[PDB]
């Protein structure tokens with residue numbers, strides 16, 4: 024069956040067939056689309072207390088292996104059959120199975136390619152994979168991560184990479200990072216009720232405090248790494264500041280911008296997510312790419328629930344911060360975003376403006392429909408927080424669906440973990 | 444059952460219950476949400492050739508009457524029962540039924556309140572209703588419409604109103620306006636292949652030409668009214684220009700803006716839609732409200748498929764129209780939108796900036812959850828084409844669902860109508 028989608032901007036039409044290979048697990052339906060939910064249950068992959076049943080793990084396992092060998096140009100009929108055998112044997116004799124080196128690499132890149140919310144998916148083939156399935160202690164996790172950061176930071180020329188930790192076994196020996204991101208600022212609730220720092224990270228910082236970390240009560244304080252190994256209680260590890268590359272915010276024209284004294288980390292890295300590969304689950308798999316202007320400019324800086332500086336710069340620019348129809352809010356956001364890009368460019372740090380990002384995506388999307396006649400896409404997340412209609416993606420009709428491999432959200436560790 | 448939704452900006456959470464009263468008719472599902480479709484089949488209410496079967500029309504009819512009487516403060520047990528009787532009788536004795544004066548008024552306001560894509564829904568109670576079910580000829584339709592326009596224009600102080608035409612009977616005697624909007628500019632495909640005017644209205648203008656209207660080949664030419672009465676072939680009626688209030692575009696700071704020589708109509712009026720009320724269908728029901736800055740500024744003027752002037756003003760502003768990372772596109776759109784608002788304000792014509800609109804909506808939404816514990820909302824359509832994250836709606840989680848009464852899209856008349 025073919026489903027027709029059109030890009031009203033260019034008039035270009037696509038025929039999606041890949042939606043069939045998609046598993047029918049969604050929070051929405053044919054009576055109320057749960058489209059607009061931050062974190063639907065369908066995109067979540069909760070914890071378990073019993074290993075994945077061998078009988079149901081097998082179909083998925085085979086399914087994957089086929090997909091893997093299906094990727095190669097010239098079929099390896101020999102190795103293919105050989106692998107399928109080895110796997111089946113392993114599953115019924117051990118209850119689970121291990122992935123080959125190259126299989127993992129393929130899986131990570133594929134899961135990224137299958138992430139409907141990532142706009143930078145044109146880079147899916149360029150990914151550095153760190154095999155840390157051999158890891159066994161919290162400290163080792165820390166060391167692996169530092170290697171990851173050192174690599175990805177690359178002295179400013181950000182590189183995409185992912186560190187894969189031991190797969191989930193029984194669901195009690197989970198290896199996972201509790202931090203939403205490897206690098207993230209602290210958020211403290213001050214005595215007068217006000218909030219200093221990143222408001223969104225208040226609950227998490229509070230946790231760090233409870234675990235022994237002493238608050239520095241500053242606007243840009245990098246939280247410690249909360250590492251959980253083998254399901255054991257987590258341990259804190261401060262990231263060596265030398266590895267934390269930041270960018271000071273300053274506007275090209277407005278010198279008063281420096282006075283706001285803003286900055287931000289260069290490395291966007293999601294740690295709290297789970298990787299699903301042919302039935303297997305990996306609760307610990309941090310991955311990173313590079314920032315997109317708007318993420319910092321619009322979201323991090325302008326969101327009321329975040330640093331919320333819109334009011335301030337509006338006054339600084341001497342705009343009618345009281346007459347909404349003056350569109351002062353808009354000029355402000357634009358200027359703030361220019362500052363962000365400029366600051367990264369001036370400091371030789373990789374950054375990408377939402378316009379270039381969107382155009383790159385359209386290209387990637389077109390390629391997807393040639394390669395596999397499909398491309399899962401969450402319109403709501405792909406259209407930039409500013410100037411939506413000015414980006415081609417805004418006009419592109421798109422289908423959202425879950426494939427495999429895939430990156431699922433997990434339930435915040437502290438909410439389920441049982442303390443020792 | 445209660446479904447939880449959160450507004451990540453304010454943290455305020457709602458509990459939706461109204462989704463139950465919603466009919467399970469959606470193009471999306473629990474395997475692929477068809478969220479992102481311009482015009483899903485679920486939102487469409489096609490034509491018919493046989494009257495609505497009395498047996499299936501009855502449940503809906505009763506359903507409505509209950510809803511109608513349920514709106515009143517003090518229950519009219521007497522009249523209620525009386526009405527239910529009268530209706531049932533009428534349906535089985537005539538095959539259909541007529542709505543009372545006040546019932547229609549209620550239905551129109553309710554269907555508006557039930558439109559998940561309208562952001563100006565806070566005004567749902569303020570609506571002027573013109574009963575034109577008595578109408579019988581194309582000419583009469585024209586006269587009723589002119590009355591509507593004269594009223595709504597209100598010399599600049601736009602007022603919301605709707606003109607209801609005779610309900611659909613057998614589906615062959617449909618009374619409907621073919622025009623997407625009452626007032627809309629022409630689009631001509633020039634000899635050199637280029638397009639003059641509103642590109643989106645090319646197909647429709649071509650039709651008008653085929654019907655005898657002679658092209659004026661200008662950028663802002665108001666098309667004639669294509670009126671269909673009793674299912675008969677349509678007839679053209681030029682709208683008296685005195686009734687067409689326009690606004691010349693000029694920027695407060697940039698005097699060169701006047702040189703672009705832009706303008707736009709003050710009255711946004713959807714004509715091509717169908718109203719569904721307790722089983723009944725009305726293919727002819729034009730309704731209007733007032734414009735929102737972005738509609739014209741961002742969409743009408745910047746969309747590539749529309750007037751597409753972004754390139755031009757970028758050069759005029761002397762911006763780096765070649766370096767995307769310069770965010771020239773963004774500064775340009777902001778400036779263009781300021782021009783729009785300014786021009787309306789200066790000419791004493793009702794206009795509403797997207798910021799004020801969004802805030803008003805949040806208020807309305809909250810009220811909805813008190814009144815009926817629910818509010819159908821299409822996030823994709825509610826978030827403004829520019830500065831999305833800067834508007835509260837962007838952060839509001841919302842549920843989309845079809846209720847009744849409701850405003851359904853129809854299949855373009857010319858595509859199905861049978862000529863005489």
Ligand code: HEM
Nearest residue numbers: 135138140141142143146183184310311312313314315430
């Ligand atoms: C090449 C650089 C990349 C760019 C420019 C990019 C950009 C983006 C952007 C802007 C988002 C939205 C983030 C948000 O709103 O919270 C996103 C989300 C996402 N990206 Fe990418 N991405 C890149 C690399 C990666 C990599 C390397 C992976 C994985 C291997 C990845 C996986 C995802 C996933 C899973 C999401 C969803 C994250 C969430 O739910 O918060 N991205 N990406």
Ligand code: HEM
Nearest residue numbers: 555558560561562563566603604730731732733734735850
């Ligand atoms: C008070 C002034 C009003 C404002 C500011 C307002 C604003 C809006 C906006 C901005 C849209 C999006 C239009 C588009 O993107 O195509 C819209 C759509 C809609 N509005 Fe309202 N609205 C108002 C009045 C009305 C009235 C009076 C009705 C009906 C009785 C109404 C019914 C709808 C419907 C059905 C849609 C969907 C139209 C479509 O599919 O193109 N609105 N409204």
Ligand SMILES: C[C@H](O)[C@H](O)[C@H]1CNc2nc(N)[nH]c(=O)c2N1
Nearest residue numbers: 059060061403404837838839840
């Ligand atoms: C409620 C709504 O889903 C929410 O605000 C979404 C909208 N789109 C988004 N898009 C991206 N990329 N990132 C986000 O965090 C969000 N938040």
Ligand SMILES: C[C@H](O)[C@H](O)[C@H]1CNc2nc(N)[nH]c(=O)c2N1
Nearest residue numbers: 417418419420479480481823824
């Ligand atoms: C493909 C996508 O649905 C389409 O471009 C939508 C997005 N949101 C919209 N929102 C509004 N208000 N109006 C529109 O015409 C659109 N177009």
